[PDB]
Design a protein around this nucleic acid. Structure first.
Ligand SMILES: [Zn+2]
Ligand SMILES: [Zn+2]
Ligand SMILES: [Zn+2]
Length: 120
DNA sequence: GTGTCACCGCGTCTATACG
DNA sequence: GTATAGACGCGGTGACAC
């Protein structure tokens, strides 16, 4: 439980006492600070292998599962994550997923128990 | 030098606290 | 019912591992 604040013309920043990275949101600092702290543990439910960040465990765990939640809408081809989905659409369809319109679908996560977004 | 993926702003979910 | 906290899922780019 420590960090320090830094104020530049209005904007407040939060600096990590250990490694001194900056953060616009205290939330993000707390989440990061664990890398040092290890106050919380996020063990994989499939191997004895532990993560310092919830989300780090999640992508690891979807990986065990093989679920392919990202679907290219141009051709139906599915993918395990954003990164591979985006490489596909860019290199095969010469389009940018972040650009302007929806080129993919992100299916709800069905293969394990995580939070489920009412918009997904 | 540069292509890949770790990192963090952002937002939306759940939980506690009302009165 | 709203308010505020705490947790963490998601995108997607630029820092840095190769
Ligand atoms: Zn740090
Ligand atoms: Zn595992
Ligand atoms: Zn496609």
């Amino acid at each position: 439980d420590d960090h320090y604040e830094l104020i530049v013309d209005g904007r407040v920043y939060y600096i990590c006492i250990v490694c001194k990275r900056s953060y616009v949101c205290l939330t993000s600092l707390r989440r990061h600070f664990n890398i040092h702290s290890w106050e919380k543990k996020y063990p994989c439910r499939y191997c004895e292998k532990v993560f310092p960040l919830a989300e780090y465990r999640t992508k690891h765990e979807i990986h065990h599962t093989g679920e392919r939640r990202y679907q290219c809408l141009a051709c139906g081809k599915s993918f395990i994550n954003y990164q591979f989905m985006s490489s596909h659409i860019k290199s095969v369809h010469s389009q940018d997923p972040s650009g302007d319109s929806k080129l993919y679908r992100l299916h709800p996560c069905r293969s394990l128990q995580i939070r489920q977004y009412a918009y997904l």
